[PDB]
Amino acid sequence: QLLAEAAKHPDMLTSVRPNGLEDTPQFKIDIDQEKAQALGVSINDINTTLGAAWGGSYVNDFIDRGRVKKVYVMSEAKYRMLPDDIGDWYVRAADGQMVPFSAFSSSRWEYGSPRLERYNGLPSMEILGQAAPGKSTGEAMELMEQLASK
Amino acid sequence: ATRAFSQIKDAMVFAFNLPAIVELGTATGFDFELIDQAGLGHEKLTQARN
Amino acid sequence: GMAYLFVRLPSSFLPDEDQGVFMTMVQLPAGATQERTQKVLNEVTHYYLT
Amino acid sequence: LKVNQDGSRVLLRDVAKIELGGENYDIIAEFNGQPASGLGIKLATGANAL
Amino acid sequence: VDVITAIKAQNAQVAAGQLGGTPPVKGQQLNASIIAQTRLTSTEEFGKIL
Amino acid sequence: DGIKFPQDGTLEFSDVTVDQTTGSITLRAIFPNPDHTLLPGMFVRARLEEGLNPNAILVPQQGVTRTPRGDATVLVVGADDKVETRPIVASQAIGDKWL
């Protein structure tokens, strides 16, 4: 509402923009621990497999040309690009047979925010702007102060 | 002691006096430091020092 | 007249001066990938250099 | 990764594509259109810029 | 010890990663965050630990 | 290695029961192997065929957003050039397009 109201005075306020990402959809993987335990797999194996395949897990260090650099383990691009790719991963059961990840999992889309800002403890959101040519920043501050008291 | 110790076999032994202030090194001479800035390794560094 | 002109004069804090460098910020729609941002930045740099 | 008692083995290169890459690919840089890298430098709290 | 192990295993947070990973395949346009198992937030949820 | 097999086979259903510790069904297919290019017991990836269906609407991914509830919406434009929000149902994503 403040941005919409401030867009109505181009003669004083120019390039009035927010500072931060707005909102993004998020993906939620529902693991049915009941079915997973009934089949024979363990929750630790499922969690480690998902985290290492899609998130990447820092494992160890190794020397390279007289310098210590880390070794990472992560899936190879093609298999972690779409939700349906979650069906390509398999987990070893208790008796050694391998069960697909799609026999005990579900997918759901939700909403969320990527960045949260707080000023002086209380939640807050920050915007920026510049005064119009031929004007002074004090007049812009006054105009925004009088616009904020609604 | 140095004169009487040079005749000892299977040992390089020396004797000396502590500097005037034993908190920093002796102010005589220079302390050069060869540095590897390309990743040559220990063997190349020793060869260059030699 | 002094009082009226003092009231009239606008206020600020510090003048802005040319420094030879400035910045450009690009924000794409939420959920955008790296390729679209690269295309937008390519457009921006091509315009700036042409 | 798996060796039975007859010599049969499962090596890492049969499962993976081990190669030298970057720690994270989130940030890319381009100088005048060509690929490039960069080091940004912030002055500490209290010092002479020159 | 069984209860302790079950609580430790079923009340943890896992870094699921990100849809459309950091190195993208040529032609990607979707990117989002994966929200996997999270910490339990109620007594009724703690009572359902297997 | 990913190389497509030169010959093609057919599918004959053999098993209808569901495994208890795998939750999976085992389909069966036959393959002519005159050159003995595949030994018994190795691992292969079989691609099946289901059928085409021209009741298909493909929408580019960057045009579809999601409401806080969870359902998906898109931005349409009307006859009077006025934009509107139309909720839709996005089930599958193929390539870079929602179906």
UniProtKB/Swiss-Prot annotation, chain B:
Parts forming coiled coils: none
Disruption phenotype: Loss of susceptibility to contact-dependent growth inhibition (CDI); inhibiting cells still contact the target.
Source organism, top-level taxon: Bacteria
Induction description: Positively regulated by MarA, Rob and SoxS transcriptional regulators (at protein level).
Compartments, as annotated in UniProt: Cell inner membrane
Family: Belongs to the resistance-nodulation-cell division (RND) (TC 2.A.6) family.
Reported function: AcrA-AcrB-AcrZ-TolC is a drug efflux protein complex with broad substrate specificity that uses the proton motive force to export substrates. (Microbial infection) Involved in contact-dependent growth inhibition (CDI), acts downstream of BamA, the receptor for CDI. Its role in CDI is independent of the AcrA-AcrB-TolC efflux pump complex.
Subunit structure, interactors included: Homotrimer, with large domains that extend into the periplasm, interacts with AcrA and TolC. AcrA may be required to stably link this protein and TolC. Interacts with AcrZ. Part of the AcrA-AcrB-AcrZ-TolC efflux pump.
The protein's name in its UniProt record: Multidrug efflux pump subunit AcrB
Lineage, opening ranks: Bacteria, Pseudomonadati, Pseudomonadota, Gammaproteobacteria, Enterobacterales
Gene that encodes it: acrB
From Swiss-Prot, chain F:
Protein name, UniProt field: Multidrug efflux pump subunit AcrA
Quaternary organization: Monomeric in solution. Homotrimeric; interacts independently with AcrB and TolC as well as AcrZ. Part of the AcrA-AcrB-TolC efflux pump. Complex assembly is independent of an efflux substrate and appears to be constitutive.
Lineage of the organism: Bacteria, Pseudomonadati, Pseudomonadota, Gammaproteobacteria, Enterobacterales
Localization: Cell inner membrane
Primary role: AcrA-AcrB-AcrZ-TolC is a drug efflux protein complex with broad substrate specificity that uses the proton motive force to export substrates. This subunit may act as an adapter protein that links AcrB and TolC stably together. It is elongated in shape, being long enough to span the periplasm.
Family, as annotated: Belongs to the membrane fusion protein (MFP) (TC 8.A.1) family.
Bilayer-spanning residue ranges: none
Disruption phenotype: Cannot grow on efflux substrates novobiocin or fusidic acid.
Organism: Escherichia coli (strain K12)
